[PDB]
Write a protein that binds this ligand. Structure first.
Ligand SMILES: Nc1ncnc2c1ncn2[C@@H]1O[C@H](COP(=O)(O)OP(=O)(O)OP(=O)(O)O)[C@@H](O)[C@H]1O
Lengths: 177, 214, 237
């Protein structure tokens, strides 16, 4: 069955987050992004490695594992590599791991909750330059840019801050190539 | 589709009892669960917010508990005004879903149906229709059946009944059955009877009338 | 302090458009994160959630009918409008609007979002019926007291409110003075498509021909007001 139904069926079973349930998760991401600064400047040098590892750990039980546009870098070996190089740390460094795994579980829920959003924006470009399954690989990519740059303390709403990067990722890809 | 399953769907208790309604959620809604109370012919009224916080100005007999998937409401001492339908609501996901409801009734000793009966008005008759009405005032439980006989001939599909709510004053139910006929069809019979059947009776009661004197 | 009142048509014809309005006081839609939502209750069934709109103009609709719902606000007039297209009898219900608290913020940045998890103030509700049946006031007939109506120590009388459309109708006895022993049954829908209900009152069998009993019938949808005195049957002299 065309993933036009395989995918769409998966996401059509995901629920939208309440206005404040979102803002709460989007904040939890920043807390699991400040705990990555701590779990990075201790185990040795910068963050992104840790972030992707925890992301894979959480991604193991995700309701939606196949996201078009995301460069899933499993590295079947690197897992136990950094997993062990973390689970064994001082008493205090275990609670920051707890914090990071949650802040990263939020980044996932937040993305899943806005998939059927990227699908309705993409649909507003049908019959044009690019096609359905194509646009989504771009919108979903903007969805990741927003969930990364987001900043509740600034005052913006996420539903909007998302649309303003989903559409932007499509109108910068409509340039083709 | 996030489903909110409420149990029991209904229940009975007496003033001063302690009861627990439950609300199970198809998926985790954390603490975003609210409990409302709706009295007949009234808007719902908030009781608990954020799962466990008593809404200000709400009686302290009420309390809520739970998180994620399982929630409960609890009335310490049931009171006269606590008999109503209770609803839960989750506001974690859109759409904010409401539970199916839980009706709460009072207990009491089987009451006897005080049966009366009213022949059609002459004012009504002169309009071409007739309505014979059979009132069953104050009984318990709701269980009761009215049977319409017209000249001993049982009647089906030409009557309609309606039950009031269990009154907080006298916690019983009242029923009103209405048999409708045309003026012409009414002007061909004499004995119009009503055969009530209820637990509070050792035999069916028939508060009948005869359209000669009544 | 907070009051919401819904307003709109008591009856709309199928396939037409239903426009409800929520007027409120005690708060503003310019308040931080505040929301105003719509909930309906079909006859004999449980609450169903419809839509919500916020101070920042964010809005959400129930999936099962988001194609038919539009919600809009007028924060300077303290009103919210819900519009529903292509209605059908299945949309017959009481429609409520309700208020949603915004988060307790440190003036701007949220912190205590606890109070947002409930709809804390509800409007009275408005009864709306979608049908092809035309509006029609009620005839009020007596349920006069008598021998077969007076059993034991106390008599019983009432009023029969016959053939009106649509719901609702309101029944009071002696302008409110009388409430004791008053039973106002729910309306039933007759085979013709018109509603019918009775209201009864039990009184002292020794005060019938002395005390005056009047039932006050109001059916707003047809703007009909009726007052009927219910005196005993002339079954005496
Ligand atoms: N108000 C609404 N909100 C959300 N979804 C809706 C609404 N009204 C209809 N829909 C559904 O959204 C769907 C979008 O099309 P989609 O590609 O999801 O089809 P589908 O669900 O895969 O079809 P099927 O259900 O036969 O498998 C429509 O099929 C429709 O059933």
């Amino acid at each position: 069955s065309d993933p036009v139904r395989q995918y769409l069926h998966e996401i059509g079973e995901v629920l939208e987050l309440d206005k404040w349930a979102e803002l709460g998760a989007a904040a939890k991401v920043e807390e699991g992004m400040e705990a990555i600064k701590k779990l990075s400047e201790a185990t040795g040098l910068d963050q992104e490695l840790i972030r992707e590892v925890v992301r894979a750990k959480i991604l193991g039980t995700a309701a939606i594992q196949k996201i078009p546009g995301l460069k899933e870098k499993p590295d079947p070996k690197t897992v136990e590599e950094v997993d062990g190089k973390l689970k064994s740390l001082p008493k205090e460094l275990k609670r920051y791991l707890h914090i990071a795994r949650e802040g990263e579980a939020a980044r996932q829920h937040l993305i899943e909750a806005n998939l059927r959003l990227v699908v309705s924006i993409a649909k507003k470009y049908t019959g044009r330059g690019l096609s359905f399954l194509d646009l989504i690989q771009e919108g979903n990519q903007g969805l990741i840019r927003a969930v990364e740059k987001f900043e509740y303390k600034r005052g913006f709403a996420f539903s909007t801050y998302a649309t303003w990067w989903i559409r932007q990722a499509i109108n910068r890809a409509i340039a083709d190539q | 589709a996030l489903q909110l399953t409420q149990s029991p769907s209904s229940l009975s208790a007496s003033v001063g009892d302690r009861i627990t309604i439950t609300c199970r959620a198809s998926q985790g809604v954390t603490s975003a669960l609210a409990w409302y109370r709706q009295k007949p012919g009234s808007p719902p009224q908030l009781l608990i917010y954020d799962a466990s916080s008593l809404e200000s100005g709400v009686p302290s007999r009420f309390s809520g508990s739970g998180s994620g998937t399982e929630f409960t409401l609890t009335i310490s001492t049931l009171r006269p005004e606590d008999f109503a339908t209770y609803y839960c609501q989750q506001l974690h996901f859109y759409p904010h879903t409401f539970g199916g409801g839980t009706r709460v009734d009072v207990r009491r000793t089987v009451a006897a149906p005080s049966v009366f009966i009213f022949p059609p008005s002459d004012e009504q008759l002169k309009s071409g229709t007739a309505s014979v009405v059979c009132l069953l005032n104050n009984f318990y439980p709701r269980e009761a059946k009215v049977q319409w006989k017209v000249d001993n001939a049982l009647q089906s599909g030409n009557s309609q009944e309606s039950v009031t709510e269990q009154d907080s004053k006298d916690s019983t139910y009242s029923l009103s059955s209405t048999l409708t006929l045309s003026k012409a069809d009414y002007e061909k019979h004499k004995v119009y009877a009503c055969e009530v059947t209820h637990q509070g009776l050792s035999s069916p009661v028939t508060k009948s009338f005869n359209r000669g004197e009544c | 302090r907070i009051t919401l009142k819904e307003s709109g048509p008591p009856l709309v014809k199928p396939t037409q458009t239903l426009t409800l309005t929520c007027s409120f006081s005690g708060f503003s839609l310019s308040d931080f994160g505040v929301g105003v939502g719509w909930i309906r209750q079909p006859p004999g069934k449980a609450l169903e959630w419809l839509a919500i709109i916020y101070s920042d103009d964010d809005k959400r609709y129930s999936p099962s009918l988001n194609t038919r719902l539009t919600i809009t606000k007028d924060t300077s007039k303290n009103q919210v409008v819900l519009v529903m297209t292509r209605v059908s009898p299945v949309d017959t219900a009481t429609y409520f609007c309700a208020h949603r608290r915004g988060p307790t913020t440190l003036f701007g940045v949220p912190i205590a979002r606890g109070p947002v998890n409930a709809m804390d103030v509800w409007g009275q509700g408005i009864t709306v019926t979608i049908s092809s049946t035309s509006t029609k006031g009620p005839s009020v007939f007596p349920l006069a007291p008598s021998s077969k109506s007076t059993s034991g120590g106390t008599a019983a009388l009432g009023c029969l409110v016959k053939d009106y459309f649509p719901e609702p109708v309101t029944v009071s006895w002696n302008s409110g003075a009388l409430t004791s022993g008053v039973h106002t049954f729910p309306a039933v829908l007759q085979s013709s498509g018109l509603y019918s209900l009775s209201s009864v009152v039990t009184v002292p069998s020794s005060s019938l021909g002395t005390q005056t009993y009047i039932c006050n019938v109001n059916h707003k949808p047809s703007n009909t007001k009726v007052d009927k005195k219910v005196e005993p049957k002339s079954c005496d002299k």
